[PDB]
């Protein structure tokens, strides 16, 4: 795809997702999903879609109630824009029952450290295209 | 400024159904949940279910499951609530509100269910 | 579900005094509880939430205390604006369930 723009915008998701860290069924793009060097050589579209599905999950679970109930987000917090991001970039690539109140703030934070993982891969990949592709 | 206006006080006959709404403004409708809570005449409070907007995810009272069909459209920012089959038990002022913690309600409609 | 209880039903209470207001929970809630005040003819109105968290525009008279099962609600002086019908909430699981108020009446 454009390489560039996917680059520019996976990097701003980068910051975004450490822009609020505390002091402390998943899609993962694995081994076999070609996202590494050599598997992006031979055929780059696995990986992206491996990288559209992810962002897809992630704007789902920050736009349902363990995001959006209580307890309510602080008017600071960069979820808000994380969100509008990850659609952002889905975007440009191609164009989930209630939860408990008490286990929510555990459950952000867990699915923010994993969507911080997700979005570094996701970096790496889109720089290297765009540097090698 | 915050307000949560709902629809008007509405006299049901027995076995109808009614559909109320709360009209959401200052505020940015998909980024909490939006609560209903019944209330009858000089008695306590009972939490009915939420609606989540940007997913229309719902989430019921058992207790009221059946009895209540909570919806939203999010281009007017307003929360809806359909009671089905109703009853003199079900005669009692409604709310919405938003996520508890940020301090919210609607001013209540007040639904009498007679012949 | 959990059943929050409240006690007492009734407070009397002269202005100036210091009162404090019970709720109970059938299961620990950690600090997942909440207050309001209902005012007659107006709806309820969060005073204190998660316990001890203060709310902004509510007076600092008001104060809660406690975590897991038994709650309290202090009002350092009480003043005659405080008349109505206290309530606890559990904030805290499925379904969210109310207590069954205390009426706090002023004496003059």
């Known amino acids: 795809p454009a390489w560039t723009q996917c680059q520019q915008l996976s990097q701003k998701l980068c910051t975004l997702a450490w822009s609020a860290h505390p002091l402390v069924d998943v899609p993962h793009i694995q081994c076999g999903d070609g996202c590494d060097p050599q598997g992006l050589r031979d055929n780059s579209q696995f990986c992206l879609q491996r990288i559209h599905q992810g962002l897809i999950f992630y704007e789902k679970l920050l736009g349902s109630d363990i995001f959006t109930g209580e307890p309510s987000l602080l008017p600071d917090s960069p979820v808000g824009q994380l969100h509008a991001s990850l659609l952002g970039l889905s975007q440009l690539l191609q164009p989930l029952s209630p939860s408990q109140p008490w286990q929510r703030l555990l459950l952000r934070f867990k699915i923010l450290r994993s969507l911080q993982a997700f979005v570094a891969v996701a970096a790496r990949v889109f720089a290297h295209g765009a540097a090698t592709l | 400024e915050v307000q949560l206006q709902q629809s008007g006080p509405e006299l049901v006959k027995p076995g109808a159904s009614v559909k109320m709404s709360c009209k959401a403004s200052?505020?940015?409708?998909?980024?909490?949940?939006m609560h209903w809570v019944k209330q009858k005449p000089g008695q306590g409070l009972e939490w009915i279910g939420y609606?989540?907007?940007?997913?229309?995810?719902?989430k019921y009272n058992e207790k009221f499951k059946g009895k209540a069909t909570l919806t939203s459209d999010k281009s007017s920012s307003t929360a809806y609530m359909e009671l089905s089959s109703l009853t003199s038990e079900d005669s009692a002022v409604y709310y919405c509100?938003?996520?508890?913690?940020?301090?919210?309600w609607g001013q209540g409609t007040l639904v009498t269910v007679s012949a | 579900d959990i059943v929050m209880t409240q006690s007492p039903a009734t407070l009397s209470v002269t202005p100036g005094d210091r009162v404090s207001l019970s709720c109970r929970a059938s299961?620990?809630?950690?600090?997942?509880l909440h207050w309001y005040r209902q005012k007659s003819h107006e709806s309820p109105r969060l005073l204190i939430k998660?316990?001890?968290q203060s709310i902004s525009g509510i007076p600092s008279r008001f104060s809660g205390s406690g975590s897991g099962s038994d709650f309290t609600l202090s009002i350092n002086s009480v003043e005659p604006e405080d008349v109505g019908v206290y309530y606890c909430?559990?904030?805290?699981?499925?379904?969210?369930?109310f207590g069954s108020g205390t009426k706090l009446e002023i004496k003059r």
């Open positions: 998660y316990a001890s």
């Open positions: 909430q559990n904030g805290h699981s499925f379904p969210f369930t």
């Open positions: 609606i989540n907007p940007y997913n229309d995810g719902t």
């Open positions: 200052g505020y940015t409708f998909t980024s909490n949940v």
């Open positions: 509100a938003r996520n508890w913690d940020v301090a919210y």
């Open positions: 299961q620990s809630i950690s600090d997942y």
